[PDB]
Design an enzyme around this catalytic site. Structure first.
Site, PDB file in Angstrom:
ATOM      1  N   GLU A 223       0.774  -1.239   0.000  1.00  0.00           N
ATOM      2  CA  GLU A 223       0.000   0.000   0.000  1.00  0.00           C
ATOM      3  C   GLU A 223       0.811   1.298   0.000  1.00  0.00           C
ATOM      4  O   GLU A 223       0.402   2.254   0.649  1.00  0.00           O
ATOM      5  CB  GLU A 223      -0.988  -0.026   1.181  1.00  0.00           C
ATOM      6  CG  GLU A 223      -0.307   0.027   2.544  1.00  0.00           C
ATOM      7  CD  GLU A 223      -0.120  -1.304   3.228  1.00  0.00           C
ATOM      8  OE1 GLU A 223       0.099  -2.322   2.527  1.00  0.00           O
ATOM      9  OE2 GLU A 223      -0.183  -1.325   4.478  1.00  0.00           O
TER      10      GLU A 223
ATOM     11  N   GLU B 145      -4.478  -4.552   9.137  1.00  0.00           N
ATOM     12  CA  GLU B 145      -5.018  -5.612   8.288  1.00  0.00           C
ATOM     13  C   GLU B 145      -6.456  -5.958   8.445  1.00  0.00           C
ATOM     14  O   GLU B 145      -7.154  -6.024   7.431  1.00  0.00           O
ATOM     15  CB  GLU B 145      -4.113  -6.846   8.245  1.00  0.00           C
ATOM     16  CG  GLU B 145      -2.715  -6.523   7.765  1.00  0.00           C
ATOM     17  CD  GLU B 145      -2.610  -5.745   6.461  1.00  0.00           C
ATOM     18  OE1 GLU B 145      -3.517  -5.869   5.606  1.00  0.00           O
ATOM     19  OE2 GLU B 145      -1.618  -5.000   6.299  1.00  0.00           O
TER      20      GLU B 145
ATOM     21  N   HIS C 289      -8.074  -4.253  -1.641  1.00  0.00           N
ATOM     22  CA  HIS C 289      -7.318  -4.314  -0.382  1.00  0.00           C
ATOM     23  C   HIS C 289      -6.318  -3.151  -0.315  1.00  0.00           C
ATOM     24  O   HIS C 289      -6.355  -2.369   0.633  1.00  0.00           O
ATOM     25  CB  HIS C 289      -6.581  -5.657  -0.254  1.00  0.00           C
ATOM     26  CG  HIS C 289      -5.834  -5.802   1.039  1.00  0.00           C
ATOM     27  ND1 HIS C 289      -6.434  -6.355   2.158  1.00  0.00           N
ATOM     28  CD2 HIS C 289      -4.553  -5.486   1.338  1.00  0.00           C
ATOM     29  CE1 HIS C 289      -5.501  -6.352   3.101  1.00  0.00           C
ATOM     30  NE2 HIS C 289      -4.358  -5.826   2.655  1.00  0.00           N
ATOM     31  N   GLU C 290      -5.459  -3.008  -1.344  1.00  0.00           N
ATOM     32  CA  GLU C 290      -4.489  -1.913  -1.365  1.00  0.00           C
ATOM     33  C   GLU C 290      -5.131  -0.527  -1.302  1.00  0.00           C
ATOM     34  O   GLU C 290      -4.657   0.321  -0.547  1.00  0.00           O
ATOM     35  CB  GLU C 290      -3.521  -2.044  -2.547  1.00  0.00           C
ATOM     36  CG  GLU C 290      -2.753  -3.358  -2.561  1.00  0.00           C
ATOM     37  CD  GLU C 290      -2.132  -3.827  -1.256  1.00  0.00           C
ATOM     38  OE1 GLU C 290      -1.705  -2.974  -0.446  1.00  0.00           O
ATOM     39  OE2 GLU C 290      -2.025  -5.062  -1.070  1.00  0.00           O
TER      40      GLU C 290
ATOM     41  N   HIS D 245      -6.295   0.403   2.232  1.00  0.00           N
ATOM     42  CA  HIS D 245      -5.193   0.819   3.108  1.00  0.00           C
ATOM     43  C   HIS D 245      -4.967   2.338   3.107  1.00  0.00           C
ATOM     44  O   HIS D 245      -4.379   2.846   4.052  1.00  0.00           O
ATOM     45  CB  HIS D 245      -3.895   0.105   2.706  1.00  0.00           C
ATOM     46  CG  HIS D 245      -3.637  -1.192   3.416  1.00  0.00           C
ATOM     47  ND1 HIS D 245      -3.649  -1.276   4.804  1.00  0.00           N
ATOM     48  CD2 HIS D 245      -3.274  -2.395   2.909  1.00  0.00           C
ATOM     49  CE1 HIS D 245      -3.352  -2.533   5.090  1.00  0.00           C
ATOM     50  NE2 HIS D 245      -3.080  -3.234   3.986  1.00  0.00           N
TER      51      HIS D 245
END
Ligand SMILES: c1ccc(Oc2ccc(-c3cnc[nH]3)cc2)cc1
Ligand SMILES: [Yb+3]
Ligand SMILES: [Yb+3]
Ligand SMILES: [Zn+2]
Length: 607
Positions: free
Chosen positions: A268, A315, A292-293, A296
């Site tokens: 990230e 996480e 997901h990235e 972040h």
């Protein structure tokens, strides 16, 4: 107290800004330059401070135009060597100074991977990339290498003129190097305060393609077109993420598709997410890694874990947001499907480590533990399971997303602990404290093994995967003829992957079953890295010798730790491939990413 750092803590002094001026030397495999740190004293009469370093060569330390005294302590294994700097004048509380450190990195810096032209797509130019998470920034430059300190940065990077440099920052121009006409200087600015593990650098023959109003995809020319297609959903995912977490504050959201040795699925790095080329499935099926990235940019980059002991905060919340993005794009039944899959990955990690293993705890104690050795699905999946459990307990996703947005707003630009998170949860959900008091907090946060309660999951999309996996597991020889390619006609790539994961949890299967599976399903022809990985693990654990060259090729042609480590372990555990696994590792060791090389070495018990 950050037990992973040897530097002065944030209660003594804090780095406010870094100005990096460096040159990338491919022939020597070193980064040479100056790190000018703007440090603010948090104490009265401050006369010295300590910085983290790892395999760095220090030339000099200059403060107010004069060279100052410094000392490097004895190396403390993976933590590196503490660097104590004597200040020329005592500082009062809140007073700032600029400390200019002239240094060079080691060619074996654990933060970097140097690639020869042969190791790249184009074969004409070398390549360099960094990976600082968790504690590798100290192997690039002297710093307070702890996520408890946030700083802005500026950088000027000199590189051979035919190459491009990129960083976790906004591109601020390029000029010929005035000291060397065979070189170019690329400039960067990161105006948002970040923990130093987010500092990133790539240097190579990179090309870009615009895929959205605030997104370029970067890679070597050979991968540009495939990457532009694979990550085309990026802008739509950014829009959903903003709706869930509040404004995107970082300006740009670019993607860099790294060479195959990139150790993680993604990283990230702000303004420039780094991704594995193993996401290039050709159908956008592995796009949850982008979700997901992107997530972040709020959970991890804005609200950060104070120490690595609290990494689950980064996480757990990111996986929770990632699953909502994919849920908004593909439906609630799909969100539950991914969540249930995640529980399965947690079952696997717990089985592998053992149910009493301290690394299966949500909050860990990393004193004298290399964070790279502790890395697993646990903080991701046990963290996600806790949040999903709380969502169900507290009234559902709309209610819990309200908490997540308030949490991000409350802690933006700060570094927090598990107690800070729990306190705010209790404050936000004050009208539901009696519900919160029913949570077994000690078990969830501090106990090893599987969580004490399993959340409720919709089974709609999982049912067909379980049914087919069970048909194969309970099949006898006289049932093998009943399987056909039509068994897969209504399964998505995600369901195919889940069918393999379910079957792999019961591996080995008889060799005749695995041979039949190849005959009817032609799994050997699948390029999707997740599916191919699970299929090859299934073959090797089921003792199929024909799979040995395929599993060795996948383990070495790419270096994503998620795939490379279990493939090498399965090959080492199979007597027919044991010797080949050890020999292949030894032959490739010099060409591997330093962290991956170390970890595979430990897994194989090869020093
Ligand atoms: C990359 C490398 C290391 C790292 O550090 C870790 C790894 C695992 C935990 C952990 C928490 N619960 C169980 N394990 C905590 C910190 C993070 C990113
Ligand atoms: Yb500018
Ligand atoms: Yb039978
Ligand atoms: Zn993450």
């Amino acid at each position: 107290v950050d037990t992973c750092s040897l530097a002065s803590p944030a209660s003594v002094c804090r780095t406010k800004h870094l100005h990096l001026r460096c040159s990338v030397d491919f022939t020597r495999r070193t980064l040479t330059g100056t790190a000018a740190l703007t440090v603010q004293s948090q104490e009265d009469n401050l006369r010295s401070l300590v910085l983290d370093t790892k395999d760095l060569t220090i030339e000099k330390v200059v403060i107010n135009g004069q060279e100052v005294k410094y000392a490097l302590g004895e190396r403390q294994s993976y933590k590196g060597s503490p660097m104590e700097i004597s200040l020329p004048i005592a500082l009062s509380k809140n007073q700032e100074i600029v400390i200019e450190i002239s240094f060079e990195t080691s060619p074996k810096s654990s933060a970097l991977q140097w690639l020869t032209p042969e190791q790249t797509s184009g074969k004409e130019h070398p390549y360099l990339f960094s990976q600082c998470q968790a504690i590798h920034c100290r192997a690039i430059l002297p710093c307070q290498d702890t996520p408890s300190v946030k700083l802005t940065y500026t950088a000027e990077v000199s590189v051979p003129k035919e190459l491009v440099a990129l960083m976790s920052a906004i591109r601020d121009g390029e000029t010929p190097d005035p000291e060397d006409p065979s070189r170019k200087i690329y400039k960067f600015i990161q105006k948002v305060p970040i923990p130093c593990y987010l500092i990133a650098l790539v240097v190579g023959a990179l090309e870009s393609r615009q895929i959205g109003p605030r997104t370029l995809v970067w890679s070597e020319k050979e991968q540009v077109e495939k990457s532009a297609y694979e990550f085309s959903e990026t802008e739509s995912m950014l829009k959903i993420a903003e709706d869930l977490g509040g404004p995107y504050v970082w300006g740009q959201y670019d993607l860099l598709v790294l060479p195959p040795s990139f150790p993680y699925g993604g990283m990230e790095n702000p303004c420039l997410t780094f991704v594995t080329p193993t996401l290039l499935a050709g159908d956008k099926s592995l796009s949850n890694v982008i979700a997901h990235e992107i997530s972040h940019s709020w959970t991890g980059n804005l609200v950060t874990n104070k120490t690595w002991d609290h990494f689950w905060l980064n996480e757990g919340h990111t996986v929770y947001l990632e699953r909502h993005i994919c849920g908004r794009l593909f439906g609630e039944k799909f969100r539950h499907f991914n969540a249930l899959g995640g529980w399965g990955e947690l079952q696997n990690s717990v089985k592998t480590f053992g149910e009493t293993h301290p690394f299966t705890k949500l909050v860990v104690d990393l004193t004298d533990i290399d964070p790279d050795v502790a890395y697993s699905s646990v903080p991701y999946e046990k963290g996600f399971a806790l949040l999903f459990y709380l969502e169900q307990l507290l009234g559902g996703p709309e209610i819990f997303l309200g908490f997540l947005k308030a949490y991000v707003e409350k802690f933006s630009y700060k570094s927090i602990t598990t107690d800070d998170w729990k306190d705010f949860l209790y404050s936000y959900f004050k009208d539901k404290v009696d519900v919160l008091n029913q949570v077994d907090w000690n078990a969830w946060l501090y106990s090893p093994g599987l969580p004490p309660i399993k959340p409720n999951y919709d089974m709609t999309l999982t049912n067909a995967c379980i049914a087919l996996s069970q048909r194969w597991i309970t099949a006898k020889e006289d049932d093998l003829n009943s399987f056909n390619a039509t068994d897969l006609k209504d399964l998505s790539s995600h369901q195919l992957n889940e069918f393999l994961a379910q079957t792999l949890q019961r591996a080995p299967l008889p060799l005749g079953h695995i041979k039949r599976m190849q005959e009817v399903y032609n799994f050997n022809a699948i390029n999707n890295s997740e599916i191919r990985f699970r299929w090859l693990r299934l073959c090797i654990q089921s003792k199929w010798e024909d799979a040995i060259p395929l599993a060795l090729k996948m383990a070495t042609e790419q270096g994503r730790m998620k795939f490379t480590r279990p493939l090498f372990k399965d090959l080492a555990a199979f007597d027919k491939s044991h010797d080949q696994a050890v020999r292949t590792y030894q032959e490739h060791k010099a060409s591997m990413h330093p962290v991956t090389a170390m970890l595979v070495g430990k897994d194989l018990k090869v020093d």
